């Protein structure tokens, strides 16, 4: 089918360099939007970088911008990220994904691997989401609220995420639901102001949500609401 294969990482010293790899099969298009995530331990997803175009611009989050080379081969379909000057900080599960042409969004992921370290005068988009954690019961409806910085129309994506295992995006577009994705999930709202309906809650559900916007780089993820028992 359509996957992407992550490989690379492990355990490395300050100062010291590594390369992930990604190779894409089962591609329908040319040169994709790419990227990199990553996730601190008890932190929240973060974004790395970003490659676009045929001529492979890219883009970098403050944190790496000088350390940190993201490029790719879109002859042998493969993604790579060369970490340079490793600092603790960079201590994370690293995903690379891909933006899909039927919702617009980043819906492909690797598995992840854990790395261990022993202009135009545009605007950055923030998103607050709300609340930070909640306790409920299966059959409970819970809604979780984004507030992005800027008016950003219906260009708001909603992921679960569990524990070690990549992001998987639930909603598109603010309101469309994701393919094989069941139907208790739901979205609303548009500009500055967004909601994620769960209507009837089960036990697969318990998880960590996060709002995130495609569109406008640098791309961002909100904070995450982490609904628990």
């Known amino acids: 089918e359509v996957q992407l294969l992550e490989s690379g990482g492990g355990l490395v010293q300050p100062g010291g360099s590594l390369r992930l790899s990604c190779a894409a099969s089962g591609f329908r298009f040319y040169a994709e939007d790419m990227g990199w995530v990553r996730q601190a331990p008890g932190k929240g997803l973060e974004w790395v970088s970003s490659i676009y175009g045929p001529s492979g611009s890219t883009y970098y989050a403050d944190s790496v911008k000088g350390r940190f080379t993201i490029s790719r081969d879109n002859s042998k379909n493969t993604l790579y990220l060369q970490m340079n000057s490793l600092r603790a ?3 994370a599960v690293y ?8 919702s617009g969004a980043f819906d492909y ?3 992840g691997t854990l790395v261990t370290v022993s202009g135009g005068g545009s605007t950055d988009i923030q998103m607050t989401q709300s609340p930070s954690s909640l306790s409920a019961s299966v059959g409970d409806r819970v809604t979780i609220t984004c507030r992005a910085s800027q008016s950003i129309s219906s260009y708001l994506n909603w992921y679960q995420q569990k524990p070690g295992k990549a992001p998987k995006l639930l909603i598109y577009g603010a309101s469309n639901l994701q393919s094989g ?3 208790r999930f739901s979205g609303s709202g548009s500009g500055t102001d967004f909601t994620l309906t769960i209507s009837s809650l089960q036990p697969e559900d318990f998880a960590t949500y996060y709002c995130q ?3 406008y780089l ?3 993820f909100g904070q995450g609401t982490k609904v628990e028992i």
């Open 109 to 111: 992921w690797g598995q």
């Open 89 to 91: 900080e960079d201590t």
């Open 181 to 183: 994705v069941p139907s």
């Open 213 to 215: 916007q495609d569109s």
């Open 95 to 102: 995903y690379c994904a891909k933006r899909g042409y039927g």
């Open 218 to 220: 640098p791309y961002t």
